[PDB]
Amino acid sequence: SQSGPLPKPSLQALPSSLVPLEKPVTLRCQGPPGVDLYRLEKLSSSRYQDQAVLFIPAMKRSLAGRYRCSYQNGSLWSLPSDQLELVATGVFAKPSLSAQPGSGGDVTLQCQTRYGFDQFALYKEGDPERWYRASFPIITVTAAHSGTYRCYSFSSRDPYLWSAPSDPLELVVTGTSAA
């Protein structure tokens, strides 16, 4: 007798789920100790394997997309993991990131490209990375933390095929030091 479904495993891309073309990435499914069999799969395709680990030595366009995994205890299948979003970067030439500061706590950042992309993604380094999204290039961030900002452009047609990252832009909001 059993009280419910077997809990989901974790699915993790190391070192990161943003993988430049030709750079390596390891997808690891992880369930409780003593699991019989893992099953790692790529969504919207018939690709799957019966092993916890998939080492991709060199990232390709065809390997980007959505992934999940589950495990078995006997004949019984666990709940599926949270869907891993594996992104190929360096698929397009990198954007150029500038910023006009707007005097109202916020900052407008331009992620400009000689391209007609309808999707842009901007992030700041530092433990919790602070991600931001948009349909237009000009993104406005409110209460923006000091740090190192980069941006990515991509088309919603292939939303896992991203540009190379922009050159970093160092934002410094003054009067917020630890002195």
């Binding site: 099953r39 969504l43 999940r68 589950s70 078995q72 004949s75 299948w77 599926p80 869907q83």
Partner: peptide, 21 residues
């Protein structure tokens, strides 16, 4: 001897796509 039996069933599939507006 003869071939082994067919294996157990696969896992349940993923979520369907989201609905329209």
């Amino acid at each position: 001897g003869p071939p082994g039996p067919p294996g157990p069933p696969g896992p349940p599939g993923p979520p369907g796509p989201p609905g329209p507006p």
